[PDB]
Amino acid sequence: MVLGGSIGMFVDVTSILIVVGGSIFVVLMKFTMGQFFGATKIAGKAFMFKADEPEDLIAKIVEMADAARKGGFLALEEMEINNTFMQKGIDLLVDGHDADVVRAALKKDIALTDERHTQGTGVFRAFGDVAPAMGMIGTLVGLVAMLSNMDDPKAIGPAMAVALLTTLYGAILSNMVFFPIADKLSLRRDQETLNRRLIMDGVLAIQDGQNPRVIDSYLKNYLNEGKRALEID
């Protein structure tokens, strides 16, 4: 690109129109514009905000359990909360709700967040699926335009530019933008699932009045498995 020549040599209104507009049309035929904006919103929060470390969550849950055991079920409202899910857990525990209702609410939030991440992954994987099809369509369009105008170089140039740059844009958007965003959304979904499971188990242990010594051992049972197994011997 910059070493090959410049970024300026990959700019074309026709190629952008074909690839991006056709992809947007195809995707909007199966997704809502507001819903697509919501998927963009969740992708941006996944890219601009790192997921909380599971170890840090475990440690702070243990600290919260210590505070609860020392000062009853209302001792967690005077010091800062990291995430919104844990904040909701705290403000449901402060209401003296039973274990079943808070568990159901947390399991509803977990399912909702999992669904949102899965649907954002689906939106961006639809984009990545349609971009190379639009690139091939652009290759066909450019080939037709070249073969129709082999006597006119002024038409040969733009036609081949469209044919090449539609494929280049489709490939770049598919393999370096859309599929990577879907993969990052899947990773962020897995991190969300782990964090939500940890937080729900911590709230469950706090409600039961369990001493934090057992709580930390129980919470450690999640981090030693899963997608991270390639790091664990």
């Binding site: 290759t139 450019g142 080939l143 070249m146 040969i156 081949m160 090449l164």
Partner: protein
Amino acid sequence: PPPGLPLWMGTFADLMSLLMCFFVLLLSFSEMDVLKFKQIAGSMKFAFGVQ
């Protein structure tokens, strides 16, 4: 569902269409011999049932 076709076939079609584009380009700044284009045209006519 049918398994579909392997990825190398997609690579092969992308390469074929790319080479098509570039050979159309090469033939754009070229002058076909009209004398040698009618022997080939007659041979294709002979081999396709017309002649």
